[PDB]
Amino acid sequence: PSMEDYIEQIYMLIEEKGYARVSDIAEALAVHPSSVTKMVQKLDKDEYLIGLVLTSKGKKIGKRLVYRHELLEQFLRIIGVDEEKIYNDVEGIEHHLSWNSIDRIGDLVQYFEEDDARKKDLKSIQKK
Amino acid sequence: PSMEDYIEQIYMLIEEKGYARVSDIAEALAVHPSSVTKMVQKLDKDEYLIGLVLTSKGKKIGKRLVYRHELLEQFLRIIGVDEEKIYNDVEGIEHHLSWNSIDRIGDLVQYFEEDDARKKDLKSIQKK
Ligand SMILES: [Co+2]
Ligand SMILES: [Co+2]
Fold it and tell me: Which residues of the sequence carry a binding annotation for Mn(2+) 2 (chains A, B)?
């Protein structure tokens, strides 16, 4: 329920529907609409947003958070984590990693994405 | 922090000094010693320990926890994360990862360990 969680979901709802309803934010984050209203005011005072609209500041952060999430899902998928486990692991770790780690994981994903033989060799290890 | 953070540090202190003083735990986790005393009583209720002595259940968990920490450090090191950032990243993510992710990270570490050309090739993508 951090500021980052809220901005992440808000950004996504705007990308999905064109707007972010309080009730949609509430559902997405499994919190009561009261909590949502509280966070909105803080987000507004810290100028992440102004229905509700993200400032360029909020947009940059939202875009980054969605990037981080997708990257980390891709990372765990590539290394062979059971698909069903991936979402909860990503949600758990995404806010705790330094940009340095995100970027190195980014490079690692790129490393596997550029020659399928590498993915096959990784798979071979798991077999042992 | 969590029960796991406590068990990790307690197991470490026993490995290092032969015993775990409340004051050493408090210092290790940067928490108030009053918090420790209360946390210790809970670990006792859940039979992770009984001075402070880990039960077989507590020793098994502690060994796993230390293993998890070390593996995750190796992982971030191998993919080239700045050394100074590694510890804080590991502390943040370690109790949020499923065993499946840990074990796949283990396989990934093994992948890089068994052929140095893989490390070299990864170092090259970083230069792009
Ligand atoms: Co996420
Ligand atoms: Co640790």
Answer: 8, 69, 91, 94
